[PDB]
Design a binder for these strands. Structure first.
Lengths: 136, 52, 386
RNA sequence: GCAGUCAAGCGUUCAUAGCGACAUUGCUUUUUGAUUCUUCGAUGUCGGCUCUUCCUAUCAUACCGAAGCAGAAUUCGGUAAGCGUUGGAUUGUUCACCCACUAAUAGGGAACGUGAGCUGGGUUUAGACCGUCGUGAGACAGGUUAGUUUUACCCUACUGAUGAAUGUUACCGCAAUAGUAAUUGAACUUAGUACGAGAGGAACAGUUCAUUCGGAUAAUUGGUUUUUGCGGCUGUCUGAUCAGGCAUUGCCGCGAAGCUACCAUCCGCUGGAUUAUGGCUGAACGCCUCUAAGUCAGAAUCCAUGCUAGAACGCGGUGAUUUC
RNA sequence: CUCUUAAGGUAGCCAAAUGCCUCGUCAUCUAAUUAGUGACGCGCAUGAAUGGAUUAACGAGAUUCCCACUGUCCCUAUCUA
RNA sequence: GUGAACAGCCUCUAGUUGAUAGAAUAAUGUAGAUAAGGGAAGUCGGCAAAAUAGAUCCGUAACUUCGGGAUAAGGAUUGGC
């Protein structure tokens, strides 16, 4: 996941290797988030680091407000297209990959999230849960 | 424990079976297997698929 | 010359050599510490692995996101008819190891076991224990003597038991025979228990109980001769490489001038002996029970057997052990279910389960129905029927 | 390159917490030289990829002793190589340099490991442009572009696989020897506590998860499809229909089974003895002293438990042992 | 104004396939660029048919980026002959 | 016959059915395919693969030697009756 988090996150399948670009689902003015690092994450020769629902990533904004581009900032993954399996046996998946810009403590830069947002993410990050609409 | 129903075929879904899609709006869809899942993706119409 | 980047070695050197097991029945290599203060009892059991299905249950684990909530788990079911006791073997301690001094057998042995002593039953004269039997003639002595020898010397005591493989869907007629250490108390008590049980039967519910953690011992599924890549999980070489790419590029430095026991090489994969630990009993089935597969929540009458029958195995008509998760070996294969060499306190290990529902749909395709009854209710009348 | 001895000095004061001049003793052989012993009827260059193993001058992780150690953070030092030591941008690069994650992103060896293992970007044949040099042919330790990577079937080693001879044949076992494995992080709680003027700010026990590794497994989900299993489609051929052939598996949708994925699920043991170190009793030396005798506690160490093979010249118990 | 040796680099162009120093400096593009591009120029050693500068079209030529694409890769699996 | 066609695919006439064979279907290959999520992070370098593609109708930039650029680009459509 990351650091700033309230709780733990049971393992969820990885969908977003470094280099993945996800839709930006806040109202910050960024359109993309491009993942360059995953806060969680350990090491294996040749393994790309990869994130998953509720992970904090480090990202840059490829498309979007100029004041917001050309720099690395933390983001949080709130939806993933790669299917994953919950402790209750259900394998679910979203229709896109989406993230929200955040500061290192987990406070969100924006103040609204567009789309649904998976519970696992919601639980890890109060401030995201707070700004979330539908959850799972 | 609940038996869900396949939202394309009306089929009984027991725990662990199939998959659950979550659309953009947030309409949740559940398929019982990968057949209904696929026909859904191809934008088939349940009303014209005779086994549903 | 100092490897440019560092990585962990592929594979575990504690599971070498990676050859075919000697026997298809994997050996119990350790029995639990004996506590001679409690009733004489078997320490393992023999069964046939039949297949897997799915469970639902509430979890009980304070502090977990999933406490007081339903989770859904793979289980595997192993066909477990009663085991028959036909011998006792006594072991003595020596400065060279445990050693067997005698074996005393039962007066009558069934064909199932007798068949284990032959390679060409159809045409043998089946003379197997026919002179041994006569030892019973004499009011006792020969037999009663050897029993007495085991009482006098003898330091550990195992019974000889066999499977009743006929009570099982398998084509194989030859039963499986094994020694199982008697852990209940006192050498003398052990052999009496053993004597008393000769020709008699022993059920699993006298060995194992719900929630128990047990070990499984079995030869692993064979796969024939494998290349390095899948055998060891070595990395594929680039697409560009000449002369193939499922290899390891460098088998060794120039010195030591010898390919070394630690580099990965093609050869047999599978058919190995594994002792797998910590498998929690989730059900102990009764064969006489027509609601095997039911629950205090799912009240329906149904047996554990899947619709269609366990694929590549058949039906479960006997007692059975249901174990959480999975187990080495494949369907049809003999498994020894051993009890724990230790007293786990895991919390995970202490949890008491109760199932809520046991899957029973066909495993032969995407089965949509638990019972014939449910299917007919859903489909209504067909063109066969009525 | 690395480590000492002396101690003038640094260090508010104070040589030696951490450092340390003038001098001075060494060690190493991944630097570079010096030499020219081997190889010029041949030993295939640089870098990378892949993979195994070894060293320790230890970066992380275990337990400790120091401090200019209040707490947190650090720094010096011991026992330690058991276990890890990464993802990228530019460059043929090694190196270098930034970004980024992390417990940490230590340093080295194995013919500057590793080309009948690959690659061929660089170097270093023959094409070619330029700059400098030259009357010229040509030259350049300058830039640039294009430039064929051969053989294993033999021995050995290594992986796995059979097997003669110990009356015959069968079933159940022992265990010498050899291998052996787990790893690291976070959150909750302890606690806004100990400590502190404040700013800040731990840990043990208990709980839930995760990382890297490993061994299996296939309920489930997903991948694969000559099930050529069902259906759909183009073109042609069998007069039409039915039903089929051909199109190097004609194409498309679904697709059981099998195989299989941190793309799936399950499982990964607990006793002793020690190291450093801190101590007990205690002389030597009527005092003192952890040490001389004796002794307690004690680490990711070691030895066992456990786990894998089972000596084809290690072994036990048991069954049946031939008239044609 | 002067010296060598006849003159003394005009018009242009430029770290260019010509720049040692050099991974030049500034700007741009990137999270990050010994790369690319635009600029700068006392240019080791650019420069006018020893042709200089420009240049539409063309190019299995060298080079940089972007969209699309994707088993190149993460990380491998499966099938046919 | 299909179709723009001396293409490809199937056919008639004519000609062949000849290029050791049998049984299996391990590894590793050679040749042919496919892959969830990501999308060049692989690599000296997108090498190899993949993606595009016929026709009709719309639409089409800089620049230019005014000829081009241009199938630029970007879109809709397509069977049977």
């Amino acid at each position: 996941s990351g650091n700033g988090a309230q709780g733990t996150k049971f393992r969820i399948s990885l969908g977003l290797p470094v280099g993945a670009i996800m839709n930006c689902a806040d109202n910050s003015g960024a359109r993309n988030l491009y993942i360059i690092a995953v806060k969680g994450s350990g090491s294996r020769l040749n393994r790309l680091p990869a994130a998953s629902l509720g992970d904090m990533v480090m990202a840059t904004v490829k498309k979007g407000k100029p004041e917001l581009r050309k720099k690395v900032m933390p983001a949080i993954v709130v939806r993933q297209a790669k299917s994953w399996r919950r402790r209750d046996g259900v394998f679910l998946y979203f229709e896109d990959n989406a993230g929200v810009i955040a500061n290192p403590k987990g406070e969100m830069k924006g103040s609204a999230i567009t789309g649904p947002v998976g519970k696992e993410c919601a639980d890890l990050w109060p401030r995201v849960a707070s700004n979330s609409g539908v959850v799972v | 424990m609940k038996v869900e129903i396949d939202s394309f075929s009306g089929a009984k879904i027991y725990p662990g079976r199939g998959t659950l899609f979550v659309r953009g709006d947030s309409k949740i869809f559940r398929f019982q297997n990968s057949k209904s899942a696929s026909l859904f993706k191809q934008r088939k119409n349940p009303r014209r698929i005779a086994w549903t | 010359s100092h490897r440019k980047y560092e990585a962990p070695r592929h594979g575990h050197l504690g599971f070498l050599p990676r050859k075919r097991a000697a026997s298809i029945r994997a050996r119990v290599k350790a029995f639990p510490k004996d506590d001679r203060s409690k009733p004489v009892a078997l320490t393992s059991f023999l069964g046939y692995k039949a297949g897997m299905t799915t469970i639902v249950r509430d979890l009980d684990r304070p502090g977990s996101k999933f406490h007081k909530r339903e989770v859904v788990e793979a289980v595997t079911v192993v066909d477990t008819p009663p085991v028959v006791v036909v011998g006792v073997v006594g072991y003595v301690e020596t400065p060279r190891g445990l050693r067997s001094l005698t074996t005393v057998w039962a007066e009558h042995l069934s064909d199932e076991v007798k068949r284990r002593f032959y390679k060409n039953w159809y045409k043998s004269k089946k003379k197997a224990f026919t002179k041994y039997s006569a030892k019973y003639a004499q009011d006792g002595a020969g037999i009663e003597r050897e029993l007495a020898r085991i009482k006098k010397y003898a330091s550990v005591v195992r019974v000889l038991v066999h499977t009743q493989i006929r009570k099982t869907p398998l084509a194989q007629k030859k039963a499986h025979l094994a020694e199982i250490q008697l852990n209940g108390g006192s050498i003398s008590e052990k052999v009496d228990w053993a004597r008393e049980h000769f020709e008699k039967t022993v059920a699993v519910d006298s060995v194992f109980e719900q929630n128990e953690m047990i070990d499984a011992i079995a030869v692993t599924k064979g796969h024939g001769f494998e290349g390095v890549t899948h055998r060891w999980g070595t990395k594929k070489l680039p697409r560009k490489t000449h002369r193939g790419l499922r290899k390891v590029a460098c088998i060794g430095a120039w010195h030591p001038a010898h390919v070394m026991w630690s580099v990965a090489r093609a050869g047999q994969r599978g058919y190995h002996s594994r002792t797998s630990i910590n498998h929690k009993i989730y059900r102990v089935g009764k064969g006489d029970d027509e609601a095997n597969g039911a629950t205090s929540f799912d009240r329906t009458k149904k047996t554990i057997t899947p619709m269609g029958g366990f694929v590549h195995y058949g039906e479960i008509k006997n007692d059975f052990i249901m174990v959480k998760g999975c187990i080495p070996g494949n369907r049809k294969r003999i498994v020894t279910l051993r009890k724990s060499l230790y007293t786990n306190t895991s919390r995970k290990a202490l949890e008491e389960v109760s199932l809520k529902w046991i899957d029973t749909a066909s495993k032969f395709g995407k089965g949509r129905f638990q019972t014939p009854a449910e299917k007919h209710a859903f489909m209504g009348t067909l063109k066969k029927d009525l």
